[PDB]
Design a protein around this ligand. Structure first.
Ligand code: PSZ
Ligand code: PSZ
Lengths: 383, 383
């Protein structure tokens, strides 16, 4: 049966890693957040069973998630228009959304930005959905090519899904402004798209509430949407697989009926979700003391990334780059395109032991005050 | 988009629950195992990051899993013929297997026993695979209808998958004898079936090694097979979602190549698996002291279930059932068909507040010395 299967399509370990996918602090570590350790201690002391969660996971996790996404006192919440399933990570949330859509709706196509996270195409294609790309990146001004975006999306038909990164666009760090979000929300209504928000970085651009502005602009305009959120980066809970799939419909009857089929899609996949990480998130979010400690830890990460963006631009200037890199200061989250070509990136790896992805994306959190000068000297050397 | 979706296809809470799905101790609780609490304390003290696991999860978890399944010193292990991905539960392992098979092989059909766990059909159908049933249960002798099983499976074509419960058949508690396993292994080779072992209860029939005899009889005969295993019941880790998908092929080159596609199927689903539960399992299995405590806890559960099987039969006789229920003593694991009809089960619920599933399956671990007499009086009343 397996003898003819084709293979599916480390060098760092065998120097600086900007190709990493996680947050690193100023010492180059990805420690467990203190709020998380405190919550894990509480769970160790107080859990009396590991009995299965319901298919949609811990109720308090769902409530806290909806408040994060929509705001406390949101009409969507008041009107019981949203249902949330706790999932194994943002990836699990995307796949539950894709399976739900493939099996229960006429959706055949999802629109994703060019560029995006490479796994988007894999997830949607796995559920039998085609993926189409829309223009996004103005590589000259290192900005959002808004006109190109809108012209691309004119090819999207009514009933197609359009995926939006909520904030901290991966890989570019370029997000729509609030006005641009509002223009897109209007356009999406007019064109009949189903918005799919992928929100893996809430809190890493400007703040928890600010980073949800775009989603909230869409939620104010649409009867229906889906949000796939992740707590991997903003709680440092990567390996515990903590995300959420939130379904929004016109009213409570409709969302409950549709959500029954979302739960059926989960039941046929992994049955019910992993408790430990989501219980940590619910414990923290629902406790004033822990939430305050967590919110400050997240602010500390957001700010450290900002300081590295500024230090990177300043240090490149000091090392004689003689090029405008100011765009980096304005970009949001851990990732930016450096503007280096695939061959400069290869050179960077081979001649200097500095590792980025081939697109020239760098993880600004791999940068530290200690590694910044050698890193920038290397970049200057390949310009 | 959602306005026309059909709904997917508590009374207990609103008396005795034999329709429960988990182990209960003699006090009616499903506590966290002591070995698990000790491992969780160790992890709280020693974990320094939540950085993502690889797609296939914690290496030590994979090694310990293969030793459990195949035996230490197994030729499959020595010859590097097996690769294991840690998954979110046995259900996750079944779905990864189904997605792997649907996308990378010519499999179109999976054969499942009539009866089985109801979610088998949901999982395989979700991956686009048809499910066919084979005969299993001799409702007169309350035994394995082996002739019917073999005659049913004669309809299976070469290249179909046949699913076997490794031990503690759910819902019947009726397992093949070793000789019957050996006959099935031979037949499977001759007919070209791909065996899929579902092993959710290792340790609950006679013991860890004994309960793997049937799988090992198949592994001795086949170049290829897949095992979907779960640690939910044998570690009491239900909600942490701890299982494994083990792929076996003729040699190391072939299994590595095929497993690359299994990892691609995982990447497009939930990316990488939840650490906490599998880390508990790896910590326990790899430590002589913790493993000894765990093995005794599992023995305690296995034995308590045996004592309830014996107490149930004795108590039914004492309460005037006047029917042979001796078959219960011989059956394996938490589940047995009581032999009650769907209407007797309904009556049991409505008139007596005793809850079983409509098939008459009962969870023997919902039985305790304290609840046994009323439960049996109720059953006698509906006979
Ligand atoms: C836009 C977007 N969508 C989905 C995901 C998946 O998040 P988790 O499944 O890890 O929670 C992520 C984060 N997953 C991820 C891990 S490394 C990485 C990268 O781009 O390096 C990305 C994301 O940035
Ligand atoms: C034969 C078989 N296959 C797969 C599974 C799934 O196990 P987990 O996904 O819970 O690890 C299980 C256990 N899942 C389960 C939870 S309640 C239940 C039942 O039959 O009541 C079954 C099983 O018995």
């Amino acid at each position: 049966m397996f003898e003819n299967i084709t293979a599916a399509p480390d060098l760092f370990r065998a120097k600086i890693n900007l190709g990493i996918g996680v947050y690193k602090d100023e010492t180059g570590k990805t420690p467990v957040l203190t709020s998380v350790k405190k919550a894990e201690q509480y769970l160790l002391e107080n859990e009396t069973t590991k009995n299965y969660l319901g298919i949609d996971g811990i109720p308090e996790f769902g409530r806290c998630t909806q408040e994060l996404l929509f705001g406390k006192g949101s009409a969507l919440i008041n009107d019981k228009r949203a249902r949330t399933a706790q999932t194994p990570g943002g990836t699990g949330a995307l796949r539950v959304a894709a399976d739900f859509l493939a099996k229960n709706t006429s959706v055949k196509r999802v629109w994703v930005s060019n560029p995006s996270w490479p796994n988007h195409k894999s997830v949607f294609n796995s559920a039998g959905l085609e993926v189409r790309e829309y223009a996004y990146y103005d590589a000259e001004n290192h900005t959002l090519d808004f006109d190109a975006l809108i012209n691309s999306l004119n090819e999207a038909q009514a009933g197609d899904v359009v995926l939006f990164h909520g904030c901290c666009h991966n890989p570019t760090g370029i997000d729509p402004t609030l006005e641009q979000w509002q223009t897109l929300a209007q356009l999406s209504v007019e064109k009949g798209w189903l918005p799919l928000f992928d929100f893996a970085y809430q809190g890493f651009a400007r703040g928890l509430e600010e980073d949800a502005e775009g989603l909230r602009a869409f939620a104010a305009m649409h009867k229906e949407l889906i949000v796939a959120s992740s707590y991997s980066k903003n709680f440092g809970l990567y390996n515990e697989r903590v995300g959420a799939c939130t379904l929004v419909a016109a009213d409570s009857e409709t969302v409950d009926r549709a959500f029954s089929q979302m739960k059926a899609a989960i039941r046929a996949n992994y049955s019910n979700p992993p408790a430990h990480g989501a219980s940590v998130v619910a414990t923290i979010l629902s406790n004033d003391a822990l939430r305050a400690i967590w919110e400050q830890e997240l602010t500390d990460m957001r700010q450290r990334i900002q300081r590295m963006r500024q230090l990177f631009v300043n240090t490149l200037q000091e090392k004689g780059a003689n090029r405008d890199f100011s765009f980096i200061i304005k970009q949001n989250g851990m990732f930016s395109f450096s503007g280096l070509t695939k061959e400069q990136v290869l050179r960077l790896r081979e001649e200097f032991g500095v590792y980025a992805v081939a697109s020239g994306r760098v993880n600004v959190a791999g940068m530290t005050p200690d590694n910044m000068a050698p890193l920038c000297e290397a970049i200057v050397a390949v310009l």
